[PDB]
Each structure stands twice: as structure tokens, then as C-alpha cells.
Amino acid sequence: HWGYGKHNGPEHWHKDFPIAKGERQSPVDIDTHTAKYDPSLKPLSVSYDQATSLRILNNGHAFNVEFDDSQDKAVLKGGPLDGTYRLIQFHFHWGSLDGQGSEHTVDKKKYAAELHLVHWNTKYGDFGKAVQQPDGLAVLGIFLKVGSAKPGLQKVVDVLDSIKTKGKSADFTNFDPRGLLPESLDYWTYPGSLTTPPLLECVTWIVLKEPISVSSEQVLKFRKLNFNGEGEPEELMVDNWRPAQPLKNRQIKASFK
Numbered sequence: 185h186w187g188y189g190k191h192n193g194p195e196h197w198h199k200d201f202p203i204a205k206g207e208r209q210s211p212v213d214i215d216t217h218t219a220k221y222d223p224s225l226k227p228l229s230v231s232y233d234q235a236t237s238l239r240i241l242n243n244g245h246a247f248n249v250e251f252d253d254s255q256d257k258a259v260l261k262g263g264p265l266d267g268t269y270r271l272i273q274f275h276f277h278w279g280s281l282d283g284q285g286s287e288h289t290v291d292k293k294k295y296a297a298e299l300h301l302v303h304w305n306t307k308y309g310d311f312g313k314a315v316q317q318p319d320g321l322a323v324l325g326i327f328l329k330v331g332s333a334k335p336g337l338q339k340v341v342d343v344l345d346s347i348k349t350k351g352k353s354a355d356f357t358n359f360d361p362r363g364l365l366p367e368s369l370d371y372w373t374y375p376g377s378l379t380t381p382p383l384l385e386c387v388t389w390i391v392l393k394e395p396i397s398v399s400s401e402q403v404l405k406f407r408k409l410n411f412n413g414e415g416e417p418e419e420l421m422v423d424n425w426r427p428a429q430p431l432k433n434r435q436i437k438a439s440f441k
């Protein structure tokens with residue numbers, strides 16, 4: 185079944201999901217000297233004030249925090265986007281050591297983790313229909329560096345104990361995603377895909393330039409999660425990241441100079 189190990193890892197995904205070798209795959213390396221300023225890009229608009237978090241779940245490849253997306257409560261607009269995209273879920277990718285763990289890299293630099301806020305374009309009515317369109321989704325990606333503790337992430341850290349293994353879920357309401365945003369909203373944008381199967385090339389990537397800092401202690405609780413289900417041998421959930429894919433015909437744009 186796909187995973188991140190040696191026999192079912194990213195190097196093998198292509199056998200079940202042939203699009204893994206397509207033309208707009210993701211994570212990519214963001215070469216900062218080849219990324220071009222685009223003055224025509226608008227500032228991003230993040231309206232997360234009415235967000236309703238509902239649950240936190242260990243799906244066997246990451247942990248997801250899920251939001252109510254049946255009304256326009258947590259939405260992203262502006263930037264490189266046409267229309268409103270509603271927040272559906274956020275999740276992270278991390279490493280087994282602090283020097284690796286992000287999916288996207290900047291000038292070949294890897295960060296300790298990467299947070300992904302997943303949104304679907306509300307012209308398509310539901311997430312299922314948005315993943316059938318070249319513009320169905322917008323993913324906001326944020327780098328995590330090990331430094332000082334991020335107070336807003338602690339509520340997530342303290343709950344991991346209870347979703348340790350695959351299939352477990354916990355109620356997780358009143359979580360505000362605004363506590364996970366850096367101070368600056370400057371970004372790089374390019375057309376790509378989801379970085380886990382089915383690798384659908386449906387995504388407009390919005391990668392924030394400024395990383396947020398997390399404590400070593402916080403990143404360490406992530407590394408305690410398990411890939412396996414309860415009652416199976418213990419495999420810690422670490423290195424759940426896909427390596428950078430060739431950029432091919434894509435131009436990375438910067439919202440800043």
C-alpha cells in the first residue's frame with residue numbers, strides 16, 4: 185500500500201499512480217534567483233476568523249486537522265487566485281532529524297517541517313469535484329524551523345497522544361489556524377500537484393517566504409506518532425515527505441522583490 189519506506193516509498197509511487205511522473209508534480213526546489221517578481225500578483229487574503237475546527241485524525245501518513253467547509257467561514261482569496269477557496273484541512277510533513285522534513289526547499293535548503301493548509305475552489309461545489317479541475321485547489325505551504333516555541337501550535341501537540349496510531353481520531357474544536365501564520369504574507373507561486381497519492385495535478389501552490397519557529401520539544405512530539413494501526417509493530421511516523429520533482433515547463437513567481 186503506498187507509504188514512505190524502502191518498499192512502498194516515493195520512488196515506487198509511479199507503479200500505482202502513473203501521474204507521479206507527470207508535468208506539474210510537486211514539491212519542487214524554489215530557486216530564488218530564477219523565480220521572477222510578478223507585480224500583477226495581488227496580496228493574499230486569509231480570512232480565518234470564522235474557522236470551525238471539528239476533528240484531528242491520524243490517517244496513517246500524517247495527522248490532519250479538519251474544518252467545517254459547508255459554508256464560507258475560513259477562506260483564502262486574492263494572490264494568484266481567481267475566486268474563493270475554502271479551508272478543508274491542514275497537516276504537516278516532518279523529518280526524523282531537524283535538518284530535513286520540508287517537501288519544498290528554498291535554494292536547496294530543507295526545513296524541519298512543512299505545514300499545508302488545503303483549500304478547494306468553491307465554484308466546484310465540493311472537494312471531490314475540485315480535484316477534477318486544473319484550478320480546483322490552493323495549498324498554502326509554510327516552513328517550520330526549530331527555534332523558539334510557537335504558542336499557537338501547542339494545542340495540537342498536546343492532543344497527539346490520543347491519535348498515536350492509524351485510524352484514531354479525536355474531537356478538536358475551537359482551534360484557530362491564525363496562530364500558525366508567520367508575520368509576513370510574501371510568497372512564491374507555481375502550478376503543481378498534491379504531494380501524496382493520488383498526486384492530482386490540481387493545485388495552485390502558495391509557499392510563504394517566512395518560516396514560523398517551533399521548539400525542538402514541539403517537533404519531537406510529532407515524531408512519536410505511528411504509521412501503523414493499534415496492535416501492529418511500531419513504526420514511528422517520521423520522514424513523511426516526498427523529494428523535489430523536476431520543475432519542467434513551470435515558472436515560479438514571487439509576490440515580492
Ligand SMILES: NCCc1c[nH]cn1
Pocket residue numbers: 243248275
Ligand atoms: N488518502 C486520502 C486522505 C487524505 C486527504 N488529505 C490527507 N489525507
Ligand SMILES: [Hg+2]
Pocket residue numbers: 315316317318319320384385386387
Ligand atoms: Hg486536476
Ligand SMILES: [Zn+2]
Pocket residue numbers: 275276277300379
Ligand atoms: Zn501535504
